[PDB]
Ligand binder design. Sequence first.
Ligand SMILES: C[C@@H](c1cccc(-c2c[nH]cn2)c1)n1cc(-c2cccc3cn[nH]c23)c(=O)[nH]c1=O
Length: 286
Amino acid sequence: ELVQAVQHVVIGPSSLIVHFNEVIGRGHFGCVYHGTLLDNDGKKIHCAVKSLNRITDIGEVSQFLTEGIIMKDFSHPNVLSLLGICLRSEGSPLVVLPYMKHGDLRNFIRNETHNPTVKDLIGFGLQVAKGMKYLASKKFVHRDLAARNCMLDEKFTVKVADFGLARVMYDKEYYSVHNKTGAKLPVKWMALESLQTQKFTTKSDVWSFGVLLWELMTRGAPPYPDVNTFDITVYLLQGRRLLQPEYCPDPLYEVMLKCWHPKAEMRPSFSELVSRISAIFSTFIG
Ligand SMILES: C[C@@H](c1cccc(-c2c[nH]cn2)c1)n1cc(-c2cccc3cn[nH]c23)c(=O)[nH]c1=O
């Protein structure tokens, strides 16, 4: 049943050549490698192969196939596509993604050799909002939305993605898995109710999106640098937020304040964020 359903997601050695010698990135989930996908005509597609080195038991493997079925359906220009999954008889399972020429958004904006304007940064955030509006229409909760998980392709199109631990189905398993592997929770990106109740919704993704807008307007600065991870909840309960960046227009900072509304039901939806940020974006010349 799950096996029959996941077949269209599986790719194998008849199409994929993983270059285990060419490492793109090292993480808590395993490594990312350069890959080559040859289609039926014979043409080459450059890709990134994420290895999920911790998935071993029946319950982990079955949750992974379920996630592949969900993520294989994704088709939106601001959402990183899933090319397929490798279910090898030997070796850890692999996730095959399209290769992103300019890396992750945080690295791109933090690099001293790159000089993006304020309009470019607002535009990058507008692309993330469009990608999240699509995810939210599928009832897909990100849980880890941050500038480090937004990729930039050869055309400077932002793709919403995740380069962390394997995705789980239940919020109870999300904390359980982070504690079992020593991977830190993305505390400074979590909504107040997520920090206190351990649950995640699309409204808590809207909170993380506000932090991502703040990362873009500061060119990759760490949020709440002087606030300890364990002091974040009291800081937020006191009504304190991230301060308005130096080159951030007043209407954009108002949008961030609405994302960080203590009442989750009062935050804007991603559809409202797309409408609001397009209006702000158009007033910027260039
Ligand atoms: C398609 C893409 C993607 C696009 C937009 C949002 C998200 C997201 C939000 N919150 C968690 N993920 C993921 N994607 C998919 C996988 C993936 C593929 C197949 C199976 C599993 C099991 N876990 N992850 C799997 C991956 O590793 N990385 C990645 O970038």
